[PDB]
Scaffold this active site. Sequence first.
Site, short mmCIF file in Angstrom:
data_model
loop_
_atom_site.label_atom_id
_atom_site.label_comp_id
_atom_site.label_asym_id
_atom_site.label_seq_id
_atom_site.Cartn_x
_atom_site.Cartn_y
_atom_site.Cartn_z
N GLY F 59 74.50 20.57 34.91
CA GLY F 59 74.60 19.27 35.80
C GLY F 59 75.88 19.10 36.11
O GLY F 59 76.74 19.89 36.40
N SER F 88 74.69 26.51 32.10
CA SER F 88 75.69 25.81 32.66
C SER F 88 76.37 25.02 31.66
O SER F 88 76.66 25.25 30.56
CB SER F 88 75.17 24.86 33.91
OG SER F 88 75.49 25.55 35.47
N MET F 89 76.43 23.73 31.97
CA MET F 89 77.22 22.71 31.26
C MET F 89 76.45 22.57 29.76
O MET F 89 76.92 22.32 28.98
CB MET F 89 77.27 21.44 32.10
CG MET F 89 78.52 20.58 31.46
SD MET F 89 79.95 21.29 31.71
CE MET F 89 80.92 20.44 30.46
N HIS F 113 78.03 30.79 33.75
CA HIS F 113 77.74 30.16 35.04
C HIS F 113 79.65 30.09 35.43
O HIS F 113 80.28 29.43 34.75
CB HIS F 113 77.27 28.99 34.94
CG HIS F 113 76.34 28.80 36.09
ND1 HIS F 113 76.29 27.70 36.69
CD2 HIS F 113 75.53 29.76 36.79
CE1 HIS F 113 75.41 27.84 37.79
NE2 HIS F 113 75.08 29.05 37.94
N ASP F 162 75.21 34.17 37.49
CA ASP F 162 74.15 33.80 36.67
C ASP F 162 73.99 34.84 35.60
O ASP F 162 73.68 35.90 36.08
CB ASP F 162 72.74 33.32 37.12
CG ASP F 162 72.77 32.10 38.04
OD1 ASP F 162 73.93 31.58 38.40
OD2 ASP F 162 71.53 31.55 38.39
#
Lengths: 179, 178, 178, 178, 178, 184, 183, 184, 184, 184, 183
Positions: F59, F88-89, F113, F162
């Site tokens: 996010g 990701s995060m 990412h 990715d």
Amino acid sequence: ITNILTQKLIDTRTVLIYGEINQELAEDVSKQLLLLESISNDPITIFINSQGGHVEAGDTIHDMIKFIKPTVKVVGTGWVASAGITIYLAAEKENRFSLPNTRYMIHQPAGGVQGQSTEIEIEAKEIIRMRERINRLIAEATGQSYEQISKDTDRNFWLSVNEAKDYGIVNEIIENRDG
Amino acid sequence: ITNILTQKLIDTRTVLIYGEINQELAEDVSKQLLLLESISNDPITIFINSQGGHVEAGDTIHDMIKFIKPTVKVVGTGWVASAGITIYLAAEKENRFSLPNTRYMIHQPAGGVQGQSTEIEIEAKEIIRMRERINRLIAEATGQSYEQISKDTDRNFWLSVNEAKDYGIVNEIIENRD
Amino acid sequence: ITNILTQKLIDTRTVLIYGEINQELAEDVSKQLLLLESISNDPITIFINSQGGHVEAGDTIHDMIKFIKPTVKVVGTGWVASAGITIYLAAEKENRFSLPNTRYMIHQPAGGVQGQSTEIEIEAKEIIRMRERINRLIAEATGQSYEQISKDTDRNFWLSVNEAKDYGIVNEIIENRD
Amino acid sequence: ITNILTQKLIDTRTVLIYGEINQELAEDVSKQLLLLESISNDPITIFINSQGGHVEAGDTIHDMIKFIKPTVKVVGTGWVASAGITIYLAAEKENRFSLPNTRYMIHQPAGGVQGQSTEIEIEAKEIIRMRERINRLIAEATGQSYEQISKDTDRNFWLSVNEAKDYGIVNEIIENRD
Amino acid sequence: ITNILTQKLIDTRTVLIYGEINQELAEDVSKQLLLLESISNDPITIFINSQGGHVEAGDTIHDMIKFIKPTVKVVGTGWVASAGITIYLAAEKENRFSLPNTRYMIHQPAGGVQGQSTEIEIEAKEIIRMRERINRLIAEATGQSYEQISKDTDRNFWLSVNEAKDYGIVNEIIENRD
Amino acid sequence: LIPTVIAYDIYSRLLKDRIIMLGSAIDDNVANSIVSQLLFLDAQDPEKDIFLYINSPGGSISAGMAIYDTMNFVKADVQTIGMGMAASMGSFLLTAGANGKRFALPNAEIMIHQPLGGAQGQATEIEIAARHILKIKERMNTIMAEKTGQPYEVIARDTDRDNFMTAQEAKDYGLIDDIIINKS
Amino acid sequence: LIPTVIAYDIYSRLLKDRIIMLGSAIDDNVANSIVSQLLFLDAQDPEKDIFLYINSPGGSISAGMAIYDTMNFVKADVQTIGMGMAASMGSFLLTAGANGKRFALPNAEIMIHQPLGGAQGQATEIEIAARHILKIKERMNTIMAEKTGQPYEVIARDTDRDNFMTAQEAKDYGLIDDIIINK
Amino acid sequence: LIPTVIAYDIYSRLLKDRIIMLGSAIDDNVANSIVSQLLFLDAQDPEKDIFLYINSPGGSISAGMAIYDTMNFVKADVQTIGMGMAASMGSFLLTAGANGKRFALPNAEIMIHQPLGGAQGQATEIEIAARHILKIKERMNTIMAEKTGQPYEVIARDTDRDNFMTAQEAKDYGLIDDIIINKS
Amino acid sequence: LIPTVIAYDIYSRLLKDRIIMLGSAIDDNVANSIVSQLLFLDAQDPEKDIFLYINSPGGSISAGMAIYDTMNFVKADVQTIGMGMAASMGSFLLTAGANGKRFALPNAEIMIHQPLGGAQGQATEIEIAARHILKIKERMNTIMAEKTGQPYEVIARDTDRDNFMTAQEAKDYGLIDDIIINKS
Amino acid sequence: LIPTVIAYDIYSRLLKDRIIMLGSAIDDNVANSIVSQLLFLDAQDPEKDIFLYINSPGGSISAGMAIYDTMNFVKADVQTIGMGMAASMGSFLLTAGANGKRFALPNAEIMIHQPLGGAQGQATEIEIAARHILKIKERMNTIMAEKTGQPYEVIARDTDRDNFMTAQEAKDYGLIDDIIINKS
Amino acid sequence: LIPTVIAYDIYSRLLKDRIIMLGSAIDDNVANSIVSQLLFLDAQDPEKDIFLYINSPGGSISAGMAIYDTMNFVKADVQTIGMGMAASMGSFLLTAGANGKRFALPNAEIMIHQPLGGAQGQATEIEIAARHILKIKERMNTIMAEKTGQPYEVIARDTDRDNFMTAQEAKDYGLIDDIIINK
Ligand code: NA
Ligand code: NA
Ligand code: NA
Ligand code: NA
Ligand code: NA
Ligand code: NA
Ligand code: NA
Ligand code: NA
Ligand code: NA
Ligand code: NA
Ligand code: NA
């Protein structure tokens, strides 16, 4: 001077089938083919760039190509897929050409039903029959056996221009008018 | 007097390819090219201002340019990108011109799939092949090696008119009809 | 009698560029300019009322104006902004006219990107280059230095018809055909 | 030269009924049939590719086919369904042809009502009558008994080109103009 | 050759009223009727396939049919309903024909009002008057009494082609031009 | 369908055992909840470990960065357990756990990412946005290089697009310390 | 209806008897709830069995995988009972129950499945997505082969398209151990 | 308006007397609630009867099938009372009540039905869907034949299209055992 | 804006005095609430009267029919008081109150009505729907004829279209027994 | 901004002092709440006055008529206080307060009004709707004539279109008895 | 997210100290809440001052007028404190506070205003609406003239269009009595 101009278009004996196959497009092609037939019995060239679309519209164009007296030559360009293939395969094998940058795709037909079991069942029987009719049509024009086509069209069966040639879809790959 | 007027348009032997490349545009261009070919074997000039669009439509225009007898000259104007480049590169190198305020862009093709792994896998193989076909086409017309084009089209590869010349896309930058 | 009528339109050697600059409009103008060029080498007058729009479409019209043989005269009317200015500035200074109720505007180009840093970074480099190309084009046609144009186009730079004259955009303000 | 061209279209004595049957399409067909009738009494060929649609529009085309003097021949192509069948069955049995890749479908009519019982009841009586009228029309043209058609149209009754022949819908399956 | 072609259309003295009755359709019909009237005083045939629509548009077509000099013959086809019936009933009884597959429907007019009692009351009085005007028009052309029509149009009154004949709407059911 | 069992709800009950569930996309709202939970647990007992379960597609980078800084701020060791998906995060936060206390369940997916963003307006505004996200990318890569033990260039190379990993691959890469299969 | 009973709500009351209801599409939210419930029940008494009722059309593979890993993580045996519909991830979770403790009610539908997904962007991005989902498919098939006792090729063949099963067929297949009728 | 009378909301109060209200379209949510209520009531006292009021237009077949299987699963007899409308899955559930304990109020409408569904995609997918719903239809007809005492062919014939019944007709058909008119 | 009063809310407080407020369009949800309230009040004390206030434009016929059958089912007399508007199913329910205990406030509007519905699909389906709603119309008319004392033909005639009535007209028609003006 | 104060919320607390707040558009929901509050307050103490604050743009005529009839039904005097805006049904309710106990605050706007409505369908249906709303208009005018002391023709004339009034003008007119400035 | 502190929420807790927060656009709902709070606080203790914090862009004139009339109705002095923005009806309410007890925080924006409205329908209806809003404008100007000490013509002139003011300017103008900086 629009005399010598649209006369020139009609002298080419060329029909373009570009885009989605639908009943409107089937009407245009039918008109053009019937128009060209009444002019003379000279060959007609059809350039096809189509992802496919409505199978019954494809059937009409297919049957009309065989119906008229003039010999029809097809030139695949860009892509020829689904209902597009049915149209393409209307021409005799000797008359099936492709430009170098074209890919080909055959697959089983798709659709939808909502309602009672009976209604769903009825439409299921109908799409199975359609799958069989198209597979036989492909097999016949292509030289492959019914069960080979049947197995290959299970999923999207993509073919490069050269593989389409080997498969019996395309007969000759051309780059120039021969000029 | 519309006699001497549309006769004048057709005497120019000029085709304009402006905007998004799609099957409709491919049909117009095909008609115009076939029409001009049956008139004479004199050269045809194509002005291209296109961001690209549908690759198969671009393929058709590309192949039609090579298919007809008349020599085709291309003049890049504004921008020539993606499928637009494929069309542009249909002309022989000697015949590839550009107006001064034009930029050029090559990149790998894009798309989308939804469904089962099998369906996704099938479409993935297909877009990889397409990437390879276009890269080879670019390499061939341009003088660059396949691996050079392959490396450069990884992301959006923007070229100024002068860099497009150095790269082998554009042959001659022109300002006037001479 | 439509003989002596559209003949009259074409005898005026007049092209109207009214509204948003896009590829469609670029195609119309290109056709008209190419048509008028093949008729004769007599001057062509272009009336421009445009807020601007697509920069690459503006580039095409700009380059086409310089490309054709006939001398092109421009008459600014209402407003001439952004891509519109680029078109306007295609004509030689002696040939750049304005009607009294016209305002002029130059600014830096705008756009949008979504995606990965790499994608954003690539598009940023590209819009910086475009900003520079347009600023140099303006500077060259206008007589101002690159750094002056660069400083002024930081924000929307609105000019009245008289200020546009002082600035080197407009050469002569006219009210009548003479 | 558009003299010898649309003359050629009209010389074919051919009408195309492709797509959804509606009042607009009924108007086009009516015009064409009336036009062809006033030219001569030579036969007219109708190619039908229709999924059906508006039953009253189908009724008009059906009745118009019988109304005009020229003998009408029908060629089923792709599919002929519902209101499409009614149109198809307007031609005498000897004149009902089909192309090889065509399927046929007859079913009972469908609709909707909202409101008071009285309103619903009224519309119910009306659709029952329509079901009966169409079933009798099918029976009559086809050779089947009313009760056979009535039983078969209970659900969607799909027929292959060969079954449509056996059933009395299609008379001759053709591939060529001969 | 478009000489002998649209001449042929106009020689038929035939007007088609297919689809929803609205002011646009009223304008087309008015034009055609006025055009045909100025050509000659020969009879005009109108084929009607209409579910009805705007009552005032129907009134105009009705009144125009009676207004022009030429005798107008009507042929009901598919369906003739509401405002459609008003148009149909403009022709003298001897001139009211029907094709075999046609159904007929008369009903009271419908509408909507929003606002104050006064506004609703005003519009109510108006639709009552309209109901009366149309019922009298139907009664007069049809041979039925006002109270009979008034009672029958309470709800949707559907009539088969034969019942429409008995009722005084249709005079003669025809299958051929003779 | 969020049960209230004894009144405590199910997440409140787990929080009493110092377990924080991060099981959604990270935005300012989620960040504030996680931060508050971390701050609260450390205030209650700075000596006992905190357990942060991570099942997130990622996010907002800044939102996750609030969680990240709070994890390092609190005296208590924050253990991270990746389950399902940590992308990701989410995977950044997973790698940010206390040394030796970063885990993933056997079939957890980890994805790393390059930062995603947007830029709109004039050339100057787009440049400002580009420079900003590039700076963000570089400090993110730096922190990841540090937590994994990989050299900066390797992180930069491997996050270009990715990059999906099994729990085992994440372990050999340095994103996690071990894989928990059973309660042992 | 979300009825309460004594101010325990009905699912909370069932949780007190170690019953977890998975009765919706599986997403990150549902997964987190189920995971928390499993974690909580095992913390309370690692010795007593947990009962996971499954009536789900499936959903997110990764979300279900969180539940799956948690089921194996907790010391307690997780019994699975399929009711109504257990499709995709739902049937995967059903098969994931403790050995000998995987059940379905007589008229429960079971459906097995190839993974569904999407891929957007440039050719490289689409390839990355394709390779990823293919990897997912292969490890899912592997786990299913293991839980059912079927060879890998059989699972791969039988999940190519939607494969609907009766409870009896699922038992035959090795997806469940026994059919439950009464208490 | 959901009244709360003493602390209990009105449905909770009725549940304390072993009454379950099924008064909406049946989906996975409703099914889970009904199932939980049945499971709870049987756990509390397997000896006392449960009362399931049914006023439903039907809904998901699999959802209703969860309720159906749970009804048979619990040791307690589940009495069914049809009120207002019991159509499709609603009437199926009504017929599924314990023998001799299936009732309807005098003016309740009962409607029986062939299964409804959908099929999308390629010919193979449509066939898979068709075969599936046909199988569903056949086992539904079988269970109904069994509960009513009607032969299979009769159920198949009578459910071909929407078949509306009065409470009296439902009783004559074998769908219900008796009509309740008053409390006594 | 539902105010609480002494842990009761205002409707709960009124329910404690055996007052049920039916003040909205009747659907399956509203029906289930009203039915539950009737069932609950009768279980508590079958000897004391229930007071059903009706201010409804109507709604689902089957839903209202559930309320109707429950009104007759419970041993307690259900008094009906019409306020504001009692139309369609609302006025049907109003007339369904215990004999001598059907009231309306002086300015209440009563409207009676032929059933409304819809029919979609093939001719067979439309016929099935038409026959069904006609059957419904006929039994509704029959029940109304019985409750009012009017002959069937009169009810059929007078419900052909929207028929608005004052409380006085409703009383003289036989729909209600009396007009309530002041407290007893 | 709905605050609680002590277990009551703010409106519940005011209700304990026999104050009812009508502060929104009048529909069936609002009507049912107001009616219940009036019924409850009168049951608690029929001797003490009720205070109905009115700040409403109006709404459903039948809904307001339920409130109106209930105001007259209860033994307690219902005082009405207009604040802000009392338009349409709002001002009708304001005028309906007990004699000598109808007030407005100094800057309250009062607006009187002809009934608003709609009519759709065939001519017969439109006539039925027109006759109905005309009847409504006439009895509303009659009640207003009675409460204000104005002759019927004056009410009919003055409500033909939106008629805005100051509190002072409303008092001269007979709509309200007096203006309240302070708590004196 | 409305924080709680002990069953009291944060606004309820502040209400216990006779503080009312008007922090949104004024409509019938907001008006009813404020009115109820004023009525309640005065019933509890008519001797103690009420504190009305105003941070509002305005809203319905009639809604605000309900609050206005209630402020004057209650025996307690209603102190007004403007924070952030007090525009239209917000600034009207701010000026309506008890004499000497109208304040604003140093950086509060005050904006005064001609009434806004709409008129639809026939000429007669539009005239009725125009006359009505003109009447409203005139009595609003009159009340403002009275509260500020400005002559009517000055208020009419200065409210012709949006008129933004600093807290200091509002004090000089007479809209507020003083600026609060610290406690
Ligand atoms: Na041929
Ligand atoms: Na060439
Ligand atoms: Na030049
Ligand atoms: Na004929
Ligand atoms: Na005449
Ligand atoms: Na830490
Ligand atoms: Na376990
Ligand atoms: Na049981
Ligand atoms: Na009773
Ligand atoms: Na009273
Ligand atoms: Na005061």
